[PDB]
PDB file of C-alpha atoms in Angstrom:
ATOM      1  CA  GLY A 621     134.278 -39.902 -62.919  1.00  0.00           C
ATOM      2  CA  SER A 622     133.510 -39.431 -66.608  1.00  0.00           C
ATOM      3  CA  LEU A 623     136.780 -37.911 -67.826  1.00  0.00           C
ATOM      4  CA  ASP A 624     138.155 -38.089 -71.373  1.00  0.00           C
ATOM      5  CA  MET A 625     141.588 -37.616 -72.952  1.00  0.00           C
ATOM      6  CA  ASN A 626     141.073 -34.737 -75.383  1.00  0.00           C
ATOM      7  CA  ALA A 627     138.017 -32.721 -74.358  1.00  0.00           C
ATOM      8  CA  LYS A 628     139.237 -29.158 -74.864  1.00  0.00           C
ATOM      9  CA  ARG A 629     140.686 -30.501 -78.084  1.00  0.00           C
ATOM     10  CA  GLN A 630     137.693 -32.445 -79.320  1.00  0.00           C
ATOM     11  CA  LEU A 631     135.352 -29.711 -78.199  1.00  0.00           C
ATOM     12  CA  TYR A 632     137.437 -26.972 -79.816  1.00  0.00           C
ATOM     13  CA  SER A 633     137.106 -29.124 -82.897  1.00  0.00           C
ATOM     14  CA  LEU A 634     133.390 -29.642 -82.360  1.00  0.00           C
ATOM     15  CA  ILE A 635     132.303 -26.154 -81.257  1.00  0.00           C
ATOM     16  CA  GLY A 636     135.618 -24.312 -80.927  1.00  0.00           C
ATOM     17  CA  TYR A 637     135.354 -21.306 -83.233  1.00  0.00           C
ATOM     18  CA  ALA A 638     137.176 -17.983 -83.530  1.00  0.00           C
ATOM     19  CA  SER A 639     133.730 -16.375 -83.425  1.00  0.00           C
ATOM     20  CA  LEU A 640     132.476 -18.441 -80.483  1.00  0.00           C
ATOM     21  CA  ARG A 641     135.524 -17.445 -78.437  1.00  0.00           C
ATOM     22  CA  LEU A 642     134.720 -20.369 -76.133  1.00  0.00           C
ATOM     23  CA  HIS A 643     136.807 -20.523 -72.952  1.00  0.00           C
ATOM     24  CA  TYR A 644     137.227 -22.254 -69.607  1.00  0.00           C
ATOM     25  CA  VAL A 645     136.367 -20.403 -66.412  1.00  0.00           C
ATOM     26  CA  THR A 646     137.671 -21.466 -63.007  1.00  0.00           C
ATOM     27  CA  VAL A 647     134.951 -21.255 -60.361  1.00  0.00           C
ATOM     28  CA  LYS A 648     136.851 -23.332 -57.819  1.00  0.00           C
ATOM     29  CA  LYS A 649     140.333 -24.808 -57.390  1.00  0.00           C
ATOM     30  CA  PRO A 650     142.177 -27.360 -55.210  1.00  0.00           C
ATOM     31  CA  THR A 651     142.506 -26.230 -51.600  1.00  0.00           C
ATOM     32  CA  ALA A 652     143.347 -27.604 -48.156  1.00  0.00           C
ATOM     33  CA  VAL A 653     139.663 -27.694 -47.249  1.00  0.00           C
ATOM     34  CA  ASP A 654     138.683 -29.001 -50.677  1.00  0.00           C
ATOM     35  CA  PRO A 655     141.250 -30.281 -53.226  1.00  0.00           C
ATOM     36  CA  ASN A 656     138.716 -29.890 -56.046  1.00  0.00           C
ATOM     37  CA  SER A 657     138.269 -27.463 -58.939  1.00  0.00           C
ATOM     38  CA  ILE A 658     135.282 -26.253 -60.953  1.00  0.00           C
ATOM     39  CA  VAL A 659     135.075 -25.104 -64.562  1.00  0.00           C
ATOM     40  CA  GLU A 660     132.495 -23.742 -66.996  1.00  0.00           C
ATOM     41  CA  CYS A 661     133.097 -23.580 -70.746  1.00  0.00           C
ATOM     42  CA  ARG A 662     131.707 -20.160 -71.656  1.00  0.00           C
ATOM     43  CA  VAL A 663     131.543 -18.468 -75.051  1.00  0.00           C
ATOM     44  CA  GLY A 664     131.821 -15.006 -76.583  1.00  0.00           C
ATOM     45  CA  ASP A 665     128.053 -14.862 -76.119  1.00  0.00           C
ATOM     46  CA  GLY A 666     128.681 -14.726 -72.379  1.00  0.00           C
ATOM     47  CA  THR A 667     126.821 -18.022 -72.137  1.00  0.00           C
ATOM     48  CA  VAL A 668     128.114 -21.261 -70.629  1.00  0.00           C
ATOM     49  CA  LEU A 669     127.962 -24.225 -73.007  1.00  0.00           C
ATOM     50  CA  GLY A 670     129.812 -26.630 -70.738  1.00  0.00           C
ATOM     51  CA  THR A 671     130.726 -27.225 -67.111  1.00  0.00           C
ATOM     52  CA  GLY A 672     133.117 -29.769 -65.641  1.00  0.00           C
ATOM     53  CA  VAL A 673     134.754 -30.467 -62.298  1.00  0.00           C
ATOM     54  CA  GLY A 674     138.146 -32.012 -61.604  1.00  0.00           C
ATOM     55  CA  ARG A 675     141.082 -32.253 -59.215  1.00  0.00           C
ATOM     56  CA  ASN A 676     142.373 -29.103 -60.884  1.00  0.00           C
ATOM     57  CA  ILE A 677     141.218 -26.551 -63.449  1.00  0.00           C
ATOM     58  CA  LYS A 678     142.295 -28.995 -66.136  1.00  0.00           C
ATOM     59  CA  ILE A 679     140.346 -32.082 -65.168  1.00  0.00           C
ATOM     60  CA  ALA A 680     137.442 -29.749 -64.634  1.00  0.00           C
ATOM     61  CA  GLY A 681     138.050 -27.968 -67.911  1.00  0.00           C
ATOM     62  CA  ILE A 682     138.513 -31.330 -69.595  1.00  0.00           C
ATOM     63  CA  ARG A 683     135.301 -32.711 -68.126  1.00  0.00           C
ATOM     64  CA  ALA A 684     133.531 -29.471 -69.055  1.00  0.00           C
ATOM     65  CA  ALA A 685     134.797 -28.989 -72.597  1.00  0.00           C
ATOM     66  CA  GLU A 686     133.873 -32.598 -73.134  1.00  0.00           C
ATOM     67  CA  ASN A 687     130.672 -32.312 -71.126  1.00  0.00           C
ATOM     68  CA  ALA A 688     129.514 -29.477 -73.345  1.00  0.00           C
ATOM     69  CA  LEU A 689     131.093 -31.326 -76.228  1.00  0.00           C
ATOM     70  CA  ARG A 690     128.954 -34.381 -75.444  1.00  0.00           C
ATOM     71  CA  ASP A 691     125.942 -32.283 -76.412  1.00  0.00           C
ATOM     72  CA  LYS A 692     125.509 -32.507 -80.186  1.00  0.00           C
ATOM     73  CA  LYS A 693     122.548 -30.161 -80.483  1.00  0.00           C
ATOM     74  CA  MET A 694     124.732 -27.412 -79.033  1.00  0.00           C
ATOM     75  CA  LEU A 695     127.615 -28.596 -81.197  1.00  0.00           C
ATOM     76  CA  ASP A 696     125.497 -28.398 -84.337  1.00  0.00           C
ATOM     77  CA  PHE A 697     124.090 -25.225 -82.840  1.00  0.00           C
ATOM     78  CA  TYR A 698     127.357 -23.364 -82.457  1.00  0.00           C
ATOM     79  CA  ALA A 699     128.667 -24.734 -85.729  1.00  0.00           C
ATOM     80  CA  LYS A 700     125.421 -24.004 -87.547  1.00  0.00           C
ATOM     81  CA  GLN A 701     125.893 -20.607 -85.981  1.00  0.00           C
ATOM     82  CA  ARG A 702     129.402 -20.161 -87.350  1.00  0.00           C
ATOM     83  CA  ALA A 703     127.893 -20.598 -90.806  1.00  0.00           C
ATOM     84  CA  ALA A 704     124.783 -18.779 -89.608  1.00  0.00           C
ATOM     85  CA  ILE A 705     126.917 -15.772 -88.662  1.00  0.00           C
ATOM     86  CA  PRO A 706     125.559 -12.363 -89.789  1.00  0.00           C
ATOM     87  CA  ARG A 707     128.904 -10.560 -89.617  1.00  0.00           C
ATOM     88  CA  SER A 708     132.279 -12.316 -89.674  1.00  0.00           C
ATOM     89  CA  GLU A 709     135.701 -10.677 -89.953  1.00  0.00           C
ATOM     90  CA  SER A 710     137.844 -13.717 -89.154  1.00  0.00           C
TER      91      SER A 710
END
């Protein structure tokens, strides 16, 4: 499908923020019945910015991080947020 090389990396660069505490959640994984995995890039806000699927939690995570990363508006949203943060300790 539409998989990249450095999604979790690029994303982390794009949105990735100590305040956004973005992460990858595994909804599904490779199994005998279905050797596929699902992932959703959530954030400290408990909201899911991205969602990708792949053979494993990586390809999914990759696809997701990237997937969410593909979206600029959100990118510029989270970033703009970082700067638009009311209270920041880090």
